[PDB]
Design a protein around this ligand. Structure first.
Ligand SMILES: O=C(Nc1cccc(S(=O)(=O)Nc2ccc(OC(F)F)cc2)c1)c1cc(F)cc(F)c1
Ligand SMILES: O=C(Nc1cccc(S(=O)(=O)Nc2ccc(OC(F)F)cc2)c1)c1cc(F)cc(F)c1
Lengths: 544, 544
């Protein structure tokens, strides 16, 4: 009952006296270790494997045997483990090694179980669920439809709430809504265990997802519902359909913009060039890219009370046709109209098509890379931004490292260390003339865990944009005057518990201000509330 | 309680109606599979890995989740899985990947627990244990001292009793007696979890092993104790110390000789050249090699009632100095004296040192490779044996494939298909002139499971040499006139359950004849007893 229960198993951390008392003497090799020693040992076992997928496979066996030791190991080595336990290793494990998720506790829905969703949730036998991560395996980036195998994405995401914000590992639920797959290999694969049919149309999709939201609201009323890795045809419409009626958010949309805005406003503080003096090229004009721009504007308005109209005029949106302007002659998509230049002539628009000529005309102080079309921030373009500011802000956020607009190394080299860089991936430091530079990674881990922990404690009726904006500001303000002097845009990733507790505290205070909080037990003053939030967090230490 | 219990979990083999009844609908992806389908799926998952160690790692995760599916997969693919789940992959997993055994149910003894062995066995909480495999990690071949990590050897060996003879997986216990290690890397390794000291001397070794045998005899009175992978300094002395007093055997010593004798007498039947006409070079003169020779003699005496003295005179023993003779001038080790030629002059002995000149003088009809010194059965030597018999019997039994005296391919090539070959490793078939040849593999799996199953049912007071000799004869007689016409020396490995049931039946009848059997419930006639033994075997099928 002790060794075989992964939540209370301590393995070699059981003392000789504990082993005798628990009648497990001789069930373990004789060495007694501390958790710190067990972590160092597990870290050596992980590094004995060269390939990410094999490191993940090892970590899965640790999680299945000693859950405290698993989470202890992730927190000791967070920056290094992140690429293994989530993007991009987790999607590779879903696509080709889906058996790595068979043993994990999750919930599988499909059309065959229509009208039974509530019964299936009841039967799962959870207590006071706090977080539910749901995907359909469609993929936000629309690469590698995973179908049913998308369960691995929900499982990996749930583990980041536990590690990042101390969501108790028993109070989190990974969910796959299998509405089919358009993955041709899977549709023909004898070993695919999911619904063997093309993805359902919107009407049936929403019937099943409505039943899921309603069942969850009734059976898991304390839960936050987080949408993960839904395709663009659904992810925005899902939030529009449910944001007011259920306690839900989408990390890809709302988390990404909260994190990027926080980093960007710290880049502005370091740059010299204040927010109304910034001239920002937004390379890429999808709904997501425009969402990030709007989140930057909203955050600058909150922190500084500049008129938002004036902040929107700092943005120069570039789509596949060129600079988005009112004089260009095309009918603009709704999301592009708000950021469209009104101050550029038809004749100038005609000559603003390539990024090099747009940069030469706009004279930007910032390049935001949200383009997903490879390395567009060329040496020539970086050299022109150096004419417009002493401290170019360059954010190559497109993933992976090959789709990225520019390497941090190149940005630092070409600017001789002047570039302020945030990345969507970890990069090693660059040294120029004995001076060391390292990009700030805008990882989504900075925001979703603290939103999850704040929404779990506060029990708000719903998650309005105010709570994401509060989380974005909280994150910005956690970057210390010391961190800022060393060129960091974010508090350090390894301090994620403190980050999450602060973000959670600020989200709770906002829910309290709006009177949407249903938990009347919580402190209503920041210092006392922060102390309370920290004590509520589950910690990967042996407890009893 | 259902999915999380590896003994009753069926995974996708639970029907839709079962999943609803058991309240696990939505705990599994929706496809329902038969066990045969699950086996094909697992077999594909195993072959997705290139390296043996990675295939083993996958099979460990299947065993931890669905034990019935694990054993079903091994039995469907036995010949292919054998090298992965035991020798030589298992020793590599012990040496460098010992974490693969952490989750497995075993028992760890050492000097720190002196006087507690019985309490530790009681606490392990087993019912009516049938088989116990114990090692100290010293290694029969004295390569790669594993210390505590030798637990993996006992675990792999126990799984071969379950797969080979349907020992119920709940009624088998893997044991490590950690009496230290002489592995210098381990003694310095911060992550070694065993007793960090050089191996104990003989007096303390036997104090601890005596306590083990006595504790086991009292707490697990129905068990057979099998010694596995003990070093030569102890393995023979252990059997001398315990064979009469406890229900125990050593598979390396007693199993190997039983299997090789059975194959060799079938090679003699195929050869034309009858046992008293055979002239057998025994290349290698260790205790083990001489044990095998004596087991061949004892089996030929039992099956054919030739005087054993006359069979012993068919053997020409070759040690590192040359042909073992009474006229050679050295003082012979006790085990070499029995097989020493008395019919070779001092002057002939002086000129009988190289294997090529011994073969030229002896004119053997058989070469037995038990030498462990690489490829000594050269083309020239094989060509000389062709002068002495139409059907040379060539047995390169030294492991691994590099220590082997000759490849089966070479033996078949050089003899143009006339060679009768048994190997200690699996080999692919060889085709010569459109005719296909494949060596017979003398795997230890043919004997120990059936001895374990016979001794579990019969509950003999002890395991005298009569029961091994009976098992050796049983195995020989299971090679059908059809198998023999196709050149096979052994019944087919994939029929291991039937083999084990027959071996077990013949062992029981022998224990009954000697009146050492303590189980009075068993049939005493072969047909009825075989039917009973088959029904008692655990089968990897879903039962309830
Ligand atoms: O926990 C058990 N044994 C253990 C033996 C050495 C060490 C440890 S540990 O917990 O201190 N470290 C550890 C663990 C599992 C890792 O994952 C992958 F390697 F197995 C990796 C490290 C644990 C255990 C659990 C059972 F359910 C049954 C049982 F008989 C033993
Ligand atoms: O058994 C479970 N799920 C399962 C899901 C798909 C398929 C199967 S299976 O049993 O039909 N096949 C299978 C299994 C484990 C393999 O090992 C390595 F891949 F996990 C390999 C194949 C089983 C299970 C067990 C739990 F303890 C909790 C839980 F939530 C689910």
């Amino acid at each position: 009952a002790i060794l075989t229960d992964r939540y209370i198993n301590r393995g070699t951390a059981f003392t000789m006296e504990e082993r005798q008392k628990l009648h497990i003497l001789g069930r373990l090799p004789p060495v007694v270790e501390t958790l710190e020693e067990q972590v160092a040992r597990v870290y050596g076992q992980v590094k004995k494997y060269e390939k990410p997928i094999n490191r993940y496979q090892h970590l899965v066996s640790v999680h299945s045997t000693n859950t405290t030791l698993y989470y202890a190991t992730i927190l000791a080595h967070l920056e290094e483990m992140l690429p293994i336990i989530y993007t991009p290793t987790v999607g590779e494990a879903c696509m080709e090694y889906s058996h790595l998720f068979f043993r994990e506790r999750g919930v599988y829905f499909n059309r065959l179980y229509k009208g039974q969703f509530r019964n299936i949730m009841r039967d799962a036998g959870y207590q006071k669920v706090e977080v539910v991560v749901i995907t359909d395996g469609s993929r936000i980036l629309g690469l590698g439809d995973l179908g049913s195998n998308g369960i691995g994405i929900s499982i990996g995401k749930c583990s980041l709430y536990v590690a990042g914000a101390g969501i108790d590992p028993r109070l989190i639920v990974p969910v796959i809504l299998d509405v089919g797959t358009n993955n041709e290999r899977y549709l023909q694969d004898k070993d695919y265990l999911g619904m063997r049919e093309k993805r359902l149309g919107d009407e049936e999709f929403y019937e099943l997802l409505d039943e899921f939201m309603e069942a969850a609201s009734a059976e898991w009323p304390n839960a936050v519902i987080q949408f993960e890795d839904f395709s663009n045809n659904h992810c925005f419409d899902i939030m529009e359909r449910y944001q007011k009626k259920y306690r839900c958010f989408n990390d890809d949309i709302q988390g990404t913009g909260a994190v990027i805005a926080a980093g960007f406003l710290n880049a502005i503080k370091l740059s010299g060039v204040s927010p109304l003096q910034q001239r920002i090229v937004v390379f890429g004009a999808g709904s997501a890219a425009v969402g990030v721009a709007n989140n930057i504007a909203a955050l600058a308005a909150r922190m500084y009370k500049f008129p938002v109209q004036d902040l929107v005029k700092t943005f120069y949106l570039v789509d596949t046709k060129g600079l988005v302007t009112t004089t260009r002659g095309d009918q603009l998509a709704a999301h592009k109209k708000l950021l469209a230049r009104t101050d550029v002539s038809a004749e100038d628009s005609a000559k603003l098509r390539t990024l090099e000529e747009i940069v030469r005309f706009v004279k930007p102080t910032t390049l935001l890379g949200l383009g997903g079309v490879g390395p567009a921030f060329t040496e020539e373009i970086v050299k022109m931004v150096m004419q417009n500011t002493e401290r170019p802000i360059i954010f190559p956020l497109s993933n992976p490292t090959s789709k990225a607009e520019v390497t941090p190394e190149n940005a630092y080299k070409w600017t001789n260390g002047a570039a302020i860089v945030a990345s969507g991936s970890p990069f090693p430091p660059t040294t120029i003339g004995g001076k060391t530079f390292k990009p700030s990674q805008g990882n989504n881990l900075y925001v979703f865990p603290g939103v999850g922990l704040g929404c779990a404690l506060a029990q708000p009726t719903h998650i309005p944009e105010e709570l994401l904006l509060t989380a974005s500001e909280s994150l910005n303000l956690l970057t210390t005057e010391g961190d800022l002097r060393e060129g960091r845009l974010y508090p350090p990733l390894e301090d994620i518990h403190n980050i999450s507790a602060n973000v959670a505290t600020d989200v709770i205070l906002e829910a309290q201000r709006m009177k949407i909080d249903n938990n009347k037990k919580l402190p209503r003053t920041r210092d006392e509330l922060l102390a309370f939030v920290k004590k509520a967090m589950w910690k990967p230490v042996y407890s009893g």
